[PDB]
Design a protein around this ligand. Structure first.
Ligand code: NA
Length: 498
């Protein structure tokens, strides 16, 4: 039992700690995650912003910092993916570990879809195969993800049909999947996410994968008690770590939305500003206000994250029941939900589910409301400007003038519900155009990123390019455009196609 424990279980610990990355390879925690995600996706999503003016001449104004943007790639390929691959190799042919094989595959897709959604082309289907060209196009990576999820759900279903105990996954549960069936439900929900991601570029694939996701007999996540979220084995939530450094402020777009909707999640997510004369208001930091080291930290008294809500021991949310309902709402809106359920029913279930996750009460009154997001007013000192609210849609689903506005409601509410996880939020914003994030006030991208289109991706890792110039060339070829922040990823068509 102990030889097998060291053989299999430790790999699962590294992988699960390495998704919302806070894996300690020997040099500490928190600080890697800060560049992995917090100074990229979490800001670009509109959720969060730092206060330090020393950073305000970098990512916030689209002058992308090479060391920061490479981090998701570097940390994942250095420490996490090779372990997921090893775990695949040692379980795929093991008669008694079909469940661990299934779980490995699901975690591998969970980790790596976040990387392709950041950069585009990645190394995935050809990893460890020593082929001439190691690179998957994003389309090829997505197809490999769907294939891996098929293999996973097959393996776990076989494990159960052969008489494997539901709780045989107990020793590897750091993601709130205590049974084999719950891993399959995780896979089904993740497949639905990926299906909606590809719905604008490849409706045929989206349709077939959504059908598989929503007809699989093990179900999808419907209750917040089953949310996929990381905890255990000494894992600490790195968002709480960065909050402890004083660096996680509310973003202007989420302040606009939550204030205008009079959203009861507002005080759960954030605290009121400490700025004099504004101490009962929620104030969000506008992205792209230029400043540099030596300047005052103009936004230091804006609203901060709620550190009773987000603590070191708080599980790190990855995939929620609420999100799953909003995915079903979109599938219904697109006519590709095999279940007999409407977009409205799913939308309202998503909002109610999100309220319940956070303890915000019942959503019935909110779902009838006519609140509109509020304008951004620059109360801070410095060169910031006021901005008129770009989002005009209400929480009431019936107040849509067309189905594009219905999709906007679904995605905007999904964005509230995915908080604080900036990667899913940012990916969906790029994919759908929603929510309508405030644009950067200053764009120092040297023409590589368009203010109105907004940032589309992160550039490839130059640390990897220096190790492997041929691979960098291959990644660039697979991207089909310039390696900068303005090139659309494969799933980003620039419009919603029904
Ligand atoms: Na334009």
């Amino acid at each position: 039992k102990e030889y097998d424990f060291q053989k299999y279980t430790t790999n699962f610990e590294t992988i699960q700690k390495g998704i919302y990355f806070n894996y300690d390879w020997g040099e500490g925690t928190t600080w890697p995650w800060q560049t992995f995600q917090n100074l990229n996706h979490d800001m670009f999503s509109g959720y969060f912003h730092d206060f330090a003016s020393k950073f305000s001449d970098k990512n916030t104004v689209y002058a992308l910092e090479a060391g920061w943007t490479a981090s998701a790639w570097n940390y994942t390929y250095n420490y996490i993916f090779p372990v997921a691959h090893k775990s695949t190799l040692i379980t795929q042919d093991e008669a008694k570990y079909k469940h661990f094989y299934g779980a490995t595959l699901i975690l591998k897709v969970e980790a790596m879809h976040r990387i392709t959604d950041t950069y585009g082309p990645i190394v995935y289907s050809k990893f460890g195969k020593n082929e001439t060209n190691s690179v998957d196009t994003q389309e090829e990576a997505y197809k490999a993800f769907f294939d891996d999820l098929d293999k996973a759900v097959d393996a776990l279903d076989t494990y159960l049909k052969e008489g494997g105990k539901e709780d045989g996954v107990k020793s590897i549960n750091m993601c709130n999947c205590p049974t084999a069936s719950r891993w399959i439900k995780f896979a089904n929900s993740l497949r639905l996410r990926l299906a909606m991601r590809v719905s604008n570029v490849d409706k045929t694939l989206a349709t077939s994968e959504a059908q598989k996701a929503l007809e699989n007999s093990y179900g999808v996540i419907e209750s917040s008690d089953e949310n996929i979220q990381i905890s255990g084995k000494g894992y600490q939530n790195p968002l709480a770590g960065v909050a402890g450094w004083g660096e996680t402020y509310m973003g202007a777009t989420i302040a606009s939305v939550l204030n205008g909707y009079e959203d009861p999640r507002i005080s759960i997510y954030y605290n009121p500003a400490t700025l004099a004369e504004h101490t009962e208001e929620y104030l969000g930091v506008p992205q792209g206000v230029y400043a540099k080291d030596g300047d005052p930290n103009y936004y230091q008294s804006y609203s901060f994250i709620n550190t009773q809500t987000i603590t070191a021991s708080t599980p790190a949310v990855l995939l929620t029941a609420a999100e799953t309902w909003f995915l079903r709402a979109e599938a219904s809106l697109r006519g590709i939900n095999p279940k007999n359920e409407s977009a409205k029913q799913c939308y309202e279930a998503g909002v109610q589910t999100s309220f319940s996750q956070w303890g915000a009460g019942d959503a019935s009154l909110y779902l009838t409301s006519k609140g509109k997001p509020t304008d951004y007013i620059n109360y801070a000192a410095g060169p910031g400007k006021d901005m008129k609210a770009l989002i005009t849609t209400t929480p009431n689903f019936d107040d849509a003038v067309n189905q594009e506005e219905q999709l906007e409601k679904i995605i905007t509410q999904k964005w509230i519900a995915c908080w604080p996880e900036g990667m899913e939020a940012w990916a969906e914003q790029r994919r759908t155009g929603y929510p309508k994030l405030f644009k950067v006030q200053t764009n120092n991208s040297n023409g590589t990123i368009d203010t109105d289109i907004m940032i589309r991706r992160l550039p490839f890792s130059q640390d990897d390019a220096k190790k492997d110039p041929e691979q960098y060339k291959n990644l660039c070829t697979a991207l089909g455009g310039a390696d900068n922040g303005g090139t659309r990823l494969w799933w980003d068509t620039g419009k919603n196609n029904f």
